[PDB]
C-alpha cells in the first residue's frame, strides 16, 4: 500500500532517500499488535483512531488528555492518516498531567502496570510501549524500563531534548531499551536532539504533523515525536513476523538506513528507522 502526500516522517521511513512524499507500507499495518502510549492520555474519540484506541489507566483525576502531546504521539504510532501502523490497537496510560509533568514514582508505576496489564489483552502479534518522556538520571526509572522490556514488551523511549549526551537522562540511559534520537527533513540531526553512545536509532522528530485534542491536528517537534515512529515501526514489523519484542530494537538498527544523517557527533550511531518495504 501507499499513502500519497503523507507527512514527511512517514515517507522518510519507507524511503532510502529524503524528499519523497509517499508512505509505502504493507497492508497488514500492525494489526494483531498492541502499543501502550505512556503519556498525557489519548483523545480516544478522535476519528483518526477509528475506535482502535482506548484509555486503560490514569494516575490523575481524569483519564482525559487535556494536554495533547499524548494524542499527538498515539497518532504517529497508529492514527489512520498520521500513523506508521495504521491498524494497531492503542492503549493509553496517563502518567503525565495536563501540563505534561509527572513524578518519577507514578511514571514507574505506569510501566509496572503495563507489564502486568498486557497479560489480559489479546495482542497476538506482540506488545510495544512508547515513552515520549524522560528527565534527569534516575536508576529507579531506568530500572522500571528494563523490567518492562524483560517482561516481553518492546520499549521505545525518547533521547530527550537538551542537545546533550543522553547518558544523564532517564529512561533514555537504560541500555536494554530502545533510545530514539530525532532528525529533520533534510537528514540532519534535530538541533535539540540528545545524542551519545546510548542511542540505538534515529526517527523523524522535527515538525511532525499528527492528531491533537479537540479532534484537530498539529505539527510539533521533539525527539518525543521520533519515539512513536519507531514504536509504530516495531509494531508493524512484529505483525509482519520479522522480529520479536526482545530483538525488535536490534533488528531496526540492523535494517536502518546507515550513514545518511548529518550532524552526528563521533560516538553516536548514524542509523535512521527504515521499514524496507518492497511491493
Amino acid at each position: 500500500a501507499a499513502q500519497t502526500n503523507a507527512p514527511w516522517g512517514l515517507a522518510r521511513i519507507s524511503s532510502t532517500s529524503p524528499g519523497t512524499s509517499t508512505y509505502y507500507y504493507d497492508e497488514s499495518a500492525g494489526q494483531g499488535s498492541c502499543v501502550y502510549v505512556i503519556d498525557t492520555g489519548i483523545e480516544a474519540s478522535h476519528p483518526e483512531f477509528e475506535g482502535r484506541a482506548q484509555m486503560v489507566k490514569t494516575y490523575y483525576y481524569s483519564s482525559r488528555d487535556g494536554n495533547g502531546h499524548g494524542t499527538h504521539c498515539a497518532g504517529t504510532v497508529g492514527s489512520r492518516t498520521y500513523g506508521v501502523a495504521k491498524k494497531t490497537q492503542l492503549f493509553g496510560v496517563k502518567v503525565l498531567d495536563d501540563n505534561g509533568s509527572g513524578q518519577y514514582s507514578t511514571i514507574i508505576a505506569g510501566m509496572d502496570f503495563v507489564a502486568s496489564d498486557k497479560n489480559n489483552r489479546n495482542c497476538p502479534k506482540g506488545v510495544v510501549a512508547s515513552l515520549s518522556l524522560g528527565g534527569g538520571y534516575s536508576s529507579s526509572v531506568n530500572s522500571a524500563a528494563a523490567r518492562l522490556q524483560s517482561s516481553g514488551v518492546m520499549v521505545a523511549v525518547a533521547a530527550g531534548n537538551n542537545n546533550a549526551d543522553a547518558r544523564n537522562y532517564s529512561p533514555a540511559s537504560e541500555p536494554s531499551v530502545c533510545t530514539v534520537g530525532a532528525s529533520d527533513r533534510y537528514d540532519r540531526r534535530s538541533s535539540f536532539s540528545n545524542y551519545g553512545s546510548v542511542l540505538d536509532i534515529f526517527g523523524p522528530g522535527t515538525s511532525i504533523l499528527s492528531t491533537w485534542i479537540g479532534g484537530s491536528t498539529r505539527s510539533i517537534s521533539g525527539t518525543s515525536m521520533a519515539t512513536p515512529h519507531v514504536a509504530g515501526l516495531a509494531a508493524y514489523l512484529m505483525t509482519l513476523g520479522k522480529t520479536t519484542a526482545a530483538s525488535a530494537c536490534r533488528y531496526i538498527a540492523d535494517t536502518a538506513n546507515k550513514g545518511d544523517l548529518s550532524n552526528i557527533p563521533f560516538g553516536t550511531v548514524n542509523l535512521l528507522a527504515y521499514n524496507n518495504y518492497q511491493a
Partner: peptide, 6 residues
C-alpha cells in the same frame, strides 16, 4: 523526551 513546537 521530545516535546508536546512547529
Amino acid at each position: 523526551p521530545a516535546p508536546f513546537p512547529a
